[PDB]
């Protein structure tokens, strides 16, 4: 084109030589051009037209040698033509970059000199890049960070630029972008793992927040309704909670922004106070309620360790829990003892027209009783867990299996019960069948209650790995066995003599496979005698199977269990406190108004001036790093 | 590598046209007068900062 291409070269390339010539020349035609379209002709000349992308943004996505050189030329060439209003403060257009600009380049290019020549020439410290490649759908689609310059800069690891764009006056430091997110909402979207990153994300989440001096940012919600502490909680940073949830600022004049206090301490012995603002369920959506109903992620048993937690699911088993665990145990075990008297002594001559669970003939007082409560309880469950069955909505099956096995068992065992109470007096004889049911899947269900206690309760969390893990692939490959053995030494079996008709028991394939599943038992005789055609070949596949069954299968599925218990053995405590966490909350959203405050947890303290908050007391004892307890609430130590 | 076996069972078994369809890599021009083809893998790294000077295309993403 003779002006255009050979610019967005010589930026490039590192050509400042030719650079000086061809800004002459770009003069040299304006001369000639009147003195009212110089600034629109030059944006048109310094554009691409068709990305919006100008020569000050192709001279830092090339990075060189020459780079600062180029930045200072074209810049001073954009003051004297008065254009360092929109040419600096140019964006791209397109669709995937729209908002992104030259200071958005630098920060990422890691050029701090080149960024603070742009600050100082007038570039806007508070664009918003919300082109599609930086509001991404699928992490490998591109890369999210918040928009805004100061967040680039916090979320690639640039301290000293992070500290020049606070400084700066115009930087609000409170915008929020497309999202709704914060600076501090997208710490929490980019934070990883230790082992991943490094704890950089920790370090600028604590200098951003002490800067600014205020509790503005962690109290704003995103457009999801959420602050950047219960965004931590939903996507599963362990490491930014545990900082949040545990922050000393020792630094008097910024003490009020913490939620850690150390209200005394005496030598070693020490006693802190753990805000609990919006992490006790007080509120609708705290951070306790998020750790255990979160399906979403894969480390919620590292999460309730964290100490105010840990500490707060304690005291709730303490008060209330513990003793509604006890009742619910109650009422659920002398509901099946009522399940099978009423079955096992049933009127079975007669062909039981008093059907059981009938409410009939005059009364006796156990016999009344006992069929109103199970019929009660039994609607009780159904209601229930046919409304807590409906909420958690089961997305995936890997949900249903580890958050809400225990739940179905119990819709199961009501509804059968319900099922069989209309096929009594109204319909045909398979009343029985599923009333059979209902108690020995209630019987058996009863491993539910063994987590109140801890040893029980990590047991039952191994059984439940065991099945998953080892039982359902053990038991798959054993029938393909026992059905493929079993037709194959069925078909064999001439037919009986009319003499004798038992000349055989793998007469058939149900009966092959019956004797078959008897010798894996241990349980009956074998006689090889059995009226075949081929006795040798006969003998071979009865071996075959015992080979493969008795010596190999069931010895390799005890060693594949000691690697499934050496690994399980390591979190089956955690996941236990998961269960029995979600059995307390539950419990919790059961109870009345007046009963919920009395158990109300916490208690209020005077952490600064003017500032009364609800806080958890725990005692610790600390002999490693001696110092003088400068910071503290009450000089006075111990209680009262 | 019992799996791998498989798949290329499988493809020493498809006709030539079914073949050429189920070809793997997009042709790019990593070089001048160099089109080659290659297969693209997207990664995310975040310990040793730097500035990427060397690369083929400055306007990032797909497209
Ligand atoms: C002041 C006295 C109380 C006043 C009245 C308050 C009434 C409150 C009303 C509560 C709900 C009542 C209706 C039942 C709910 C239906 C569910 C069901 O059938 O089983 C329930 C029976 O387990 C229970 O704990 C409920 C029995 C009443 C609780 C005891 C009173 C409150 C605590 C008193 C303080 C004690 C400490 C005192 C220390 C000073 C729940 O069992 P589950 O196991 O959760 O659910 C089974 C299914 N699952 C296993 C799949 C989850
Ligand atoms: C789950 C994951 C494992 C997948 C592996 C799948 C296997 C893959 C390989 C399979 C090998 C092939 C075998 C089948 C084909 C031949 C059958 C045939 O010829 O006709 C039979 C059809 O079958 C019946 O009638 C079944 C009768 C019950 C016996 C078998 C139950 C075993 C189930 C297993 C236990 C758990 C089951 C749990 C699920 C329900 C005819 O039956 P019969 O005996 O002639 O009846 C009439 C004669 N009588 C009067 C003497 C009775
Ligand atoms: C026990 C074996 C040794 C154990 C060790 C295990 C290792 C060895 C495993 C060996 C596998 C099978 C062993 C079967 C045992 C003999 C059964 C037999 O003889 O049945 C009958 C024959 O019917 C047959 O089917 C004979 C065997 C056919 C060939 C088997 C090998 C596959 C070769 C296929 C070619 C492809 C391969 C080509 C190369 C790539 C006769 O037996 P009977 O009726 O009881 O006899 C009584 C006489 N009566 C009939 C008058 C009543
Ligand atoms: C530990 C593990 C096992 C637990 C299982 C429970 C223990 C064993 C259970 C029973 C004993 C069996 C012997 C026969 C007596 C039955 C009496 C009876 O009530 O029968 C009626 C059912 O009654 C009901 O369904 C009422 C429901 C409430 C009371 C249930 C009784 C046991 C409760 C506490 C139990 C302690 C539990 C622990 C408490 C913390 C109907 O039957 P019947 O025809 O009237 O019966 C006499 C028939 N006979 C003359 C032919 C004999
Ligand atoms: C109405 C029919 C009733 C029949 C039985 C009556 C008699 C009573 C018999 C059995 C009930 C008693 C056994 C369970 C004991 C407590 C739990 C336990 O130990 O661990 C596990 C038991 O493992 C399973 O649930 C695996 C799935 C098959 C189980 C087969 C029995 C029950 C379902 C029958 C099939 C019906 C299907 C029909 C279509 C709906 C817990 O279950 P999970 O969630 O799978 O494990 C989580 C694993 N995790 C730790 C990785 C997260
Ligand atoms: C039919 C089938 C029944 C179902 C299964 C029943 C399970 C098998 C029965 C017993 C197993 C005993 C194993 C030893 C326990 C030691 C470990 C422990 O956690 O101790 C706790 C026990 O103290 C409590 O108060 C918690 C349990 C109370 C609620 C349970 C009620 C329902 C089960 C009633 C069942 C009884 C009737 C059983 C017979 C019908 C200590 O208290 P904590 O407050 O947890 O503090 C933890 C402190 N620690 C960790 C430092 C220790
Ligand atoms: C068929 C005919 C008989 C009936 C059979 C029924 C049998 C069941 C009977 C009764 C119910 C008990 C069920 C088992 C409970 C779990 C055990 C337990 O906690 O062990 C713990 C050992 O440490 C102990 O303290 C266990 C000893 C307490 C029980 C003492 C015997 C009384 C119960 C009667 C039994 C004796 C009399 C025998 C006859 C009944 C190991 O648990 P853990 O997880 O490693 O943690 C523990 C603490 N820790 C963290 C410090 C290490
Ligand atoms: C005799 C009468 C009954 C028939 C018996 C035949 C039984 C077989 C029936 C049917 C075929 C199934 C064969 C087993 C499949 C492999 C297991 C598997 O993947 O285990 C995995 C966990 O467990 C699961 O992933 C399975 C849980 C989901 C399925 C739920 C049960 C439905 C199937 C019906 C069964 C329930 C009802 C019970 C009755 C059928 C463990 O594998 P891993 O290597 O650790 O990796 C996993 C992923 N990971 C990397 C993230 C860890
Ligand atoms: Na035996
Ligand atoms: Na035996
Ligand atoms: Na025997
Ligand atoms: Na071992």
């Not at 919006?52 to 810049?75: D, Q």
Request: some cysteine; aromatic content about 12%.
């Amino acid at each position: 084109r003779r002006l255009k291409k050979r610019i967005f070269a010589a930026v490039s390339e590192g050509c400042v030589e030719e650079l000086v010539e061809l800004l002459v020349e770009l003069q040299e035609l304006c001369r000639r051009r009147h003195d009212e379209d110089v600034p629109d002709f030059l944006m048109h000349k310094l554009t691409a037209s068709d990305t919006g992308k100008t020569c000050l943004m192709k001279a830092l996505l090339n990075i060189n040698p020459n780079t600062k050189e180029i930045v200072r030329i074209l810049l001073a060439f954009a003051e004297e033509n008065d254009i360092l209003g929109r040419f600096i403060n140019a964006e791209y257009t397109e669709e995937a970059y729209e908002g992104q600009t030259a200071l958005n380049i630098a920060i990422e290019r890691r050029q701090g000199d080149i960024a603070a020549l742009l600050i100082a020439a007038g570039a806007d410290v508070n664009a918003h890049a919300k082109g599609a490649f930086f509001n991404p759908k699928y992490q490998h689609e591109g890369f999210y960070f918040g928009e805004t310059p100061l967040a680039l800069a916090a979320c690639t690891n640039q301290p000293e630029i992070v500290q020049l764009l606070m400084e700066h006056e115009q930087t609000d430091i409170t915008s929020r972008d497309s999202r709704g997110n914060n600076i501090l909402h997208a710490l929490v979207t980019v934070a990883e793992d230790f082992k991943t990153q490094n704890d950089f994300v920790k370090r600028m989440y604590d200098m951003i927040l002490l800067r600014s001096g205020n509790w503005e940012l962690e109290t704003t919600r995103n457009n999801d309704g959420l602050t950047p502490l219960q965004l931590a909680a939903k996507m599963g940073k362990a490491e930014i909670l545990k900082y949040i949830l545990s922050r000393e600022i020792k630094e008097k004049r910024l003490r009020s922004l913490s939620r850690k206090f150390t209200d005394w301490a005496y030598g070693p012995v020490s006693s802190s106070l753990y805000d609990l603002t919006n992490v006790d369920t007080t509120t609708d959506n705290s951070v306790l309620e998020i750790t255990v109903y979160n399906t979403n992620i894969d480390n919620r048993h590292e999460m309730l360790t964290l100490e105010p937690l840990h500490t707060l699911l304690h005291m709730k088993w303490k008060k209330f829990a513990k003793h509604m665990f006890f009742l619910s145990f109650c009422f659920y075990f002398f509901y099946n003892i009522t399940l099978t008297l009423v079955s096992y002594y049933r009127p079975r001559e007669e062909e039981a027209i008093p059907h059981p669970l009938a409410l009939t003939h005059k009364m006796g007082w156990l016999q009344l009783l006992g069929r109103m409560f199970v019929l009660i309880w039994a609607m009780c469950i159904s209601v229930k867990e046919g409304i807590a069955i409906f909420l958690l909505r089961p997305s995936d099956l890997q949900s249903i299996l580890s958050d809400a096995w225990f739940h179905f068992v119990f819709f199961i065992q009501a509804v059968l019960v319900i099922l069989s109470v209309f096929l009594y007096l109204f319909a045909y004889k398979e009343y029985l069948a599923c009333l059979v049911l209902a108690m020995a899947l209630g019987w058996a269900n009863m491993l539910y209650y063994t987590r109140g206690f801890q040893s029980m309760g990590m047991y039952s969390v191994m059984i439940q790995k065991v099945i998953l893990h080892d039982v359902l692939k053990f038991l798959f490959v054993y029938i393909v066995f026992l059905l493929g053995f079993g037709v194959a030494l069925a078909s064999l079996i001439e037919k009986c003599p009319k003499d004798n008709k038992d000349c055989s028991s793998y007469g058939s394939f149900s009966d092959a496979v019956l004797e078959l599943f008897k010798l894996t038992i241990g349980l009956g005789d074998l006689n090889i005698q059995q009226n075949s055609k081929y006795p040798i070949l006969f003998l071979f596949l009865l071996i075959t199977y015992v080979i493969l069954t008795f010596v190999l299968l069931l010895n390799m599925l005890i060693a594949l269990m000691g690697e499934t218990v050496e690994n399980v053995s390591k979190e089956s405590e955690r996941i236990w406190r998961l269960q029995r966490a979600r059995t307390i909350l539950e419990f919790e959203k059961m109870l009345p108004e007046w009963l919920r405050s009395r158990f109300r947890m916490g208690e209020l303290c005077k952490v600064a001036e003017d500032d009364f908050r609800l806080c958890l007391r725990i005692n610790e004892v600390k002999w490693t790093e001696w110092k003088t307890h400068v910071s503290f609430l009450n000089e006075d130590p111990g209680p009262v």
